[PDB]
Design a protein around this ligand. Structure first.
Ligand SMILES: O=C(NCc1ccc2c(c1)CCO2)c1ccccc1
Ligand code: NA
Lengths: 305, 301
């Protein structure tokens, strides 16, 4: 029994984390095969950051301008190039700890584990969701740029996120491992802001199913609804619209608990319209939306990695 | 910025997880140097789970009754011994992945990471706290026995918990790595129940200090309180008593924010009285008690 926000075991990724220094800026890099990946803004001075030309800033740097430390051992950079917003440093040694891996770009609402890192030394691991507004509610301090986010599907690590910056509201923005930003952000010090966020509806429903499996059932009721009716209510409370593909995805959980999705939507509608009436669900007083359906299935069936 | 329930990176513990089998029972073991540690109730049988005599069950076992599998490899057991409620299997291979480590028994309110495992392979990592009633509010399925809880301050892994059982309320109970149970529980299936649980007051205060550090002040007030008056109010909300030790511990967070510890106790009293009135603190609509003063300092600026 029990239900916790749970990250993937991070050991496969810890073995890929290295320290990258260019001048007075130290941050984190990801070392896979013979390439170190890191944010391209590592090459900027604070004055470059206002309006950088990254192609030009890079040509002046030689290979020995990039100091890479894997633990307490130095790596030799033999080449350097840029892909979108990530810098790729070719090194003379393949990482013998390179796990089986892929680079994947995730969709808003999907979750992943972040390995927070400083000076190439992993310091913490936590679960995040890619928000509908393409930010993530992370926990980062200066020196954390280049920390990465990932899932483990079977034995393959799927890398999906690399941290670049913090927005004024304290949420965080970054890229996939091919350097494309999530959301309408750029890697430069100008005025940027998170858009108004919304709640991930399919994830809230998944978490209600998890609550039921753990014996938390007070919110269930006799009613059911329709997609049209519910989606009107969802729009009213700044929830993402529920689609037929979401209902199919929650299909397994509906069969296991005997609560149809629109049966549970009637529960969620009543909670949105009336509150929780002093009660909690899985120890939360607010509706939790950073557990996907797959997360609930995996934690409630024990799929080890 | 940001504040998350953060666990420790689990790699150093992943490299120590093995599978222990005895009879039809399989659970997890912890492989440090040439010893594998696992819950002694792996040697129990079906009809003998209310009142096992572990000394009698153990003396009938030979080393080859224990099947220990590290990854795809079979480890050879060359000795065994029981220490309180943990079984210590001597093996013929020292674990090449053994980190710098120690064993530490923790007190209620302390936090640690749990590496949940099944059949010797890690499933996930999450953060926990030892409740005042000596249980932990974990996420464990059948076969998770032998999963461990730990901290990794500096480069040294401090092992503080090994999972043994689930109580009827769905909370979990276990031992330190010396095999001594946390709280009044025993490794028997006799009727056992956890004491009424209470909120860890010093931790809530730490977390309120965290909210201020990250820029939120809405819950402060112009008031203060004596320590005894605070405890008289807080006990009525099932909160743990706050001690002078706790006040001393919050000293640093107090100095960093400018808010005296007893001034923050006054803010907590008001929050208990008023609720949140639709607002949230660090993302929660409830008061959070699984961040220690030490946690807040490591995570915040
Ligand atoms: O903790 C559970 N089993 C482990 C266990 C605990 C005590 C004990 C033995 C085994 C043998 C000797 O005494 C559990 C409890 C509720 C539901 C499912 C599992
Ligand atoms: Na219903």
């Amino acid at each position: 029994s029990g239900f916790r926000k749970m990250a993937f075991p991070s050991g496969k990724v810890e073995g890929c984390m290295v320290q990258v220094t260019c001048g007075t800026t130290t941050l984190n890099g990801l070392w896979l095969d013979d390439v170190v990946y890191c944010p391209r803004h590592v090459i900027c001075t604070s004055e470059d950051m206002l309006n950088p030309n990254y192609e030009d800033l890079l040509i002046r740097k030689s290979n020995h301008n990039f100091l890479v430390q894997a633990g307490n051992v130095q790596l030799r950079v033999i080449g350097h190039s840029m892909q979108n917003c990530v810098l790729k440093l070719k090194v003379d040694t393949a990482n013998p700890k390179t796990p089986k891996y892929k680079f994947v770009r995730i969709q808003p609402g999907q979750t992943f584990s972040v390995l927070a890192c400083y000076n190439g030394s992993p310091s913490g691991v936590y679960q995040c969701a890619m928000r509908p507004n393409f930010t993530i509610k992370g926990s980062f301090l200066n020196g954390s740029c280049g920390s990465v986010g990932f899932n483990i599907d079977y034995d393959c690590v799927s890398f999906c996120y690399m941290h670049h910056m913090e927005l004024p509201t304290g949420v965080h923005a970054g890229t996939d491992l091919e350097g494309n930003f999530y959301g309408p952000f750029v890697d430069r010090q100008t005025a940027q802001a998170a858009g108004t966020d919304t709640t991930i509806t399919v994830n809230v429903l998944a978490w209600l199913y998890a609550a039921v499996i753990n014996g938390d059932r007070w919110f269930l009721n006799r009613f059911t609804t329709t997609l049209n009716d519910f989606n009107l209510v969802a729009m009213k409370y700044n929830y993402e619209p529920l689609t037929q593909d979401h209902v199919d995805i929650l299909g397994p959980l509906s069969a296991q608990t005997g609560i149809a999705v629109l049966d549970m939507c009637a529960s969620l509608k009543e909670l949105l319209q009336n509150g929780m009436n002093g009660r909690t669900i899985l120890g939360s007083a607010l509706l939790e939306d950073e557990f996907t359906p797959f997360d609930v299935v995996r934690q409630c069936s024990g799929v080890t990695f």
